[PDB]
């Protein structure tokens, strides 16, 4: 289903927020570097742990 009751599952990487635009197109925006992207950032962007890695 749409799961439109709780925004918790573990979909996007840490930092990324799931929002929707005025066209009803879903988009993701990271709040670390602060980039809004209308594409899914899980393709080649696999999270390797979550340490202080530069």
From Swiss-Prot:
Changing residue 14 to R: No effect on interaction with TP73. It is found in: Cytoplasm; Nucleus; Mitochondrion; Golgi apparatus. It comes from the Eukaryota. Residues 10-43 form the WW domain. A motif (Nuclear localization signal) lies at residues 4-8. Belongs to the short-chain dehydrogenases/reductases (SDR) family. Putative oxidoreductase. Acts as a tumor suppressor and plays a role in apoptosis. Required for normal bone development. May function synergistically with p53/TP53 to control genotoxic stress-induced cell death. Plays a role in TGFB1 signaling and TGFB1-mediated cell death. May also play a role in tumor necrosis factor (TNF)-mediated cell death. Inhibits Wnt signaling, probably by sequestering DVL2 in the cytoplasm. The WW 1 domain mediates interaction with TP53, and probably TP73, TFAP2C, LITAF and WBP1. It is linked to Defects in WWOX may be involved in several cancer types. The gene spans the second most common chromosomal fragile site (FRA16D) which is frequently altered in cancers. Alteration of the expression and expression of some isoforms is associated with cancers. However, it is still unclear if alteration of WWOX is directly implicated in cancerogenesis or if it corresponds to a secondary effect. Esophageal cancer: A malignancy of the esophagus. The most common types are esophageal squamous cell carcinoma and adenocarcinoma. Cancer of the esophagus remains a devastating disease because it is usually not detected until it has progressed to an advanced incurable stage. Interacts with TP53, p73/TP73 and MAPK8. Interacts with MAPT/TAU, RUNX2 and HYAL2. Forms a ternary complex with TP53 and MDM2. Interacts with ERBB4, LITAF and WBP1. Interacts with DVL1, DVL2 and DVL3. May interact with FAM189B and SCOTIN. Interacts with TNK2. Interacts with TMEM207. Interacts (via WW domain) with VOPP1. This is WW domain-containing oxidoreductase. It comes from Homo sapiens (Human). The gene is WWOX.
